Amino acid sequence: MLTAEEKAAVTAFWGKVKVDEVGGEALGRLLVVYPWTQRFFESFGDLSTADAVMNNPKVKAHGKKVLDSFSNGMKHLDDLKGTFAALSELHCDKLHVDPENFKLLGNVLVVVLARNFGKEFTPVLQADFQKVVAGVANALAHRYH
Amino acid sequence: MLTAEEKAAVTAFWGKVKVDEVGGEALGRLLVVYPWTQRFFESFGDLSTADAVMNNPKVKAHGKKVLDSFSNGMKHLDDLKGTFAALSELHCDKLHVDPENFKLLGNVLVVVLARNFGKEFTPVLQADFQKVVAGVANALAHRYH
Amino acid sequence: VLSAADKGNVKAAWGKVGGHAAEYGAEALERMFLSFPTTKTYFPHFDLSHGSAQVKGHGAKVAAALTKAVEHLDDLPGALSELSDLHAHKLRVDPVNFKLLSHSLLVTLASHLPSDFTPAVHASLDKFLANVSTVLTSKYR
Amino acid sequence: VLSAADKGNVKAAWGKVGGHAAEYGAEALERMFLSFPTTKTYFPHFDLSHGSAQVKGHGAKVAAALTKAVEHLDDLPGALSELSDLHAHKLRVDPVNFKLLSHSLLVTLASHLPSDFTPAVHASLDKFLANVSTVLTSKYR
Ligand code: HEM
Ligand code: HEM
Ligand code: HEM
Ligand code: HEM
């Protein structure tokens, strides 16, 4: 989507992300800030308080999983659609996940990166990531019917 | 975005719309239902009431103008982007029109089509138009920077 | 905030719907499912085919709720307290979906009441539906 | 609806912003302009260059309004009445733009207070901003 310099910037920045950590953090924050998203993770156990969510080992593991998958996309910024085609299909037909959730997670992801990288997460860098999370959300929404 | 079939169905239906009448109504309803849209048409005159807006000769003239352009788009369903690229630019650089407005107008237009065609404006038809309106709003917002 | 005039328009327009309310609710649902396929993610255990009993049954409940709301325009929050708790604590439908059903309903009213669906009624209905949506999602967090 | 807990969280977090409010205001705006360029259509006569006095000046006014919001957490509508009037009758900024500024502000706060921006505070600020947004567009129609 982005330019060759923007691609270079995002790539380089991403190489610094501690994916298990940022993953668990992002997923955990999503369940706390937008509690209705909890509807899909009832099996995860206790999600009643912020602490319960954030310390939940399954929220943790799942966050890791989602972000490893996201990282895969970071390697295919040119074909996000092809990359997430199988997963779009899965989220729709088997998990029945409203794609609106993908935007919510994308936005939470951006806040987490800002919290974790402080001043390094510049307004320009943020702009690049907004384009990415939007691109990913759209790729995942793509095979819905 | 539309299939050959959807295109065919939409094209065939479009040939029954009385563009002038529908255009003035659509623009008029937009100014009445979402009054903040009035911000760009101060020069049109009196917009204080539902009646002032609906009978305003400028609203009507402008409504037609927008709808003719829309009709032009209907003849180029395969390249909405190319067709509206210059208009996109113009709306951004000279008019300073928030692209969100294009979304509001697309929705009001589907409501106006329904009100004018009653039962002929079927659930399937409507679905097709929802796609059209969306693709147009997107082509018009595509050169914002 | 529904003005005096808004309330009058809603009551009058709902009045014209009359007995077809159940019918319009089912059509709104169907229009919503074809137009915005993502809304179907909330009805996995439903038969969403054209004319399904499930869809007609649900449309009638939706409409019945709206009918209730219209009778208690001066207290939507009380009128809708249990559907509020139900959407918030059990269904947990993402808020954007309310906009989609609303639109779908307006299109339905428009196609069935061409003469009563004036610009001013359109505007009051749009506001009413938004208000209803706001009340249904008020206990989400 | 702000809970008692939300109100303590907002007061605490805003307390930590303290003297930097104006600065964070200017930075949230700058982030908004870059990530969501359509927001620029409302500032056609602004020098939007990085560091402009205009953006800094505007950033400070937005921040002072928020500070006033934080002080009257039990009367947002009364505390922000003049600003509702202004946005509703003159500015007429489409409601979607409020979510874009809220997000940008959230991003700014997180980068500046990493240790204080806990999941719970995040959730409370998000709700506070949503409530500020709602108040600001409540007179639109
Ligand atoms: C937006 C970026 C996302 C990516 C890349 C992603 C990716 C994945 C992957 C790789 C899996 C495992 C698939 C499998 O079991 O074969 C998965 C499962 C799942 N995802 Fe997504 N996901 C994303 C967002 C979301 C969101 C926002 C939600 C809902 C709030 C969600 C709900 C689920 C659920 C419920 C599962 C199945 C969990 C289980 O094993 O029980 N995902 N996702
Ligand atoms: C979505 C479909 C739309 C299309 C195809 C469209 C197309 C056009 C065209 C062809 C013109 C005239 C260009 C010229 O020769 O100067 C125009 C002008 C304009 N449009 Fe759009 N438009 C659309 C929507 C909107 C919306 C939603 C708004 C704002 C509510 C808007 C605001 C304006 C204004 C203010 C002008 C200038 C009128 C004048 O000369 O005073 N347009 N548009
Ligand atoms: C005007 C807006 C709405 C009203 C008045 C409304 C009202 C209702 C009512 C009265 C029920 C049935 C309670 C029962 O019989 O137990 C219900 C259930 C339900 N609603 Fe809502 N609703 C609205 C919007 C939505 C939206 C936008 C969605 C999602 C797209 C939705 C999804 C559901 C689901 C999935 C159920 C349960 C269906 C079942 O399995 O029987 N609702 N709603
Ligand atoms: C938390 C949300 C917001 C708050 C607290 C806020 C507050 C304010 C304040 C305090 C002013 C200055 C009034 C004066 O001149 O004395 C203002 C003006 C203005 N705001 Fe809002 N605002 C918010 C959201 C927005 C958004 C989202 C936009 C557009 C994206 C916007 C666009 C404007 C514009 C264009 C002006 C007038 C600036 C000028 O030309 O001098 N505001 N706002």
UniProtKB/Swiss-Prot annotation, chains A, B:
All residue ranges annotated as the Globin domain in the record: 1-145
Phosphothreonine, modified sites: 11
Record Pfam families: Globin (PF00042)
Modified residues (S-nitrosocysteine): 92
Signal peptide stretch: none
Modified residues (Phosphoserine): 43
UniProt cross-references to InterPro entries, sorted A to Z: Globin (IPR000971), Globin-like_sf (IPR009050), Globin/Proto (IPR012292), Hemoglobin_b (IPR002337), Hemoglobin_oxygen_transport (IPR050056)
One Gene Ontology term, aspect cellular component: hemoglobin complex
Residues annotated to bind heme b: 62, 91
Residues with PTM N6-acetyllysine: 58, 81
Tissue spec. comment: Red blood cells.
Superkingdom of the organism of origin: Eukaryota
Keyword set, alphabetical order: Acetylation, Heme, Iron, Metal-binding, Oxygen transport, Phosphoprotein, S-nitrosylation, Transport
GO biological process: cellular oxidant detoxification; hydrogen peroxide catabolic process
MF-aspect GO terms: heme binding; hemoglobin alpha binding; metal ion binding; oxygen binding; oxygen carrier activity
Subunit structure: Heterotetramer of two alpha chains and two beta chains.
UniProt function note: Involved in oxygen transport from the lung to the various peripheral tissues.
Family: Belongs to the globin family.
Official protein name in the record: Hemoglobin subunit beta
Name of the gene encoding the protein in the UniProt record: HBB
Curated annotation (Swiss-Prot), chains C, D:
Residues modified to Phosphothreonine: 108, 134, 137
Positions where N6-acetyllysine occurs in the chain: 16
Annotated O2 binding sites: 58
Post-translational modification Phosphotyrosine, affected residues: 24
Expressing tissues: Red blood cells.
Record bears the keyword Transport: yes
Organism per entry: Bos taurus (Bovine)
Keyword hit for Transit peptide: no
Protein name: Hemoglobin subunit alpha
N6-succinyllysine found at: 7, 11, 16, 40
Protein residues bound to heme b: 87
A Pfam family: Globin
GO biological process: cellular oxidant detoxification; hydrogen peroxide catabolic process
Role played: Involved in oxygen transport from the lung to the various peripheral tissues.
Modified residues (Phosphoserine): 3, 35, 49, 102, 124, 138
Keyword annotations: Acetylation, Heme, Iron, Metal-binding, Oxygen transport, Phosphoprotein, Transport
Similarity annotation: Belongs to the globin family.
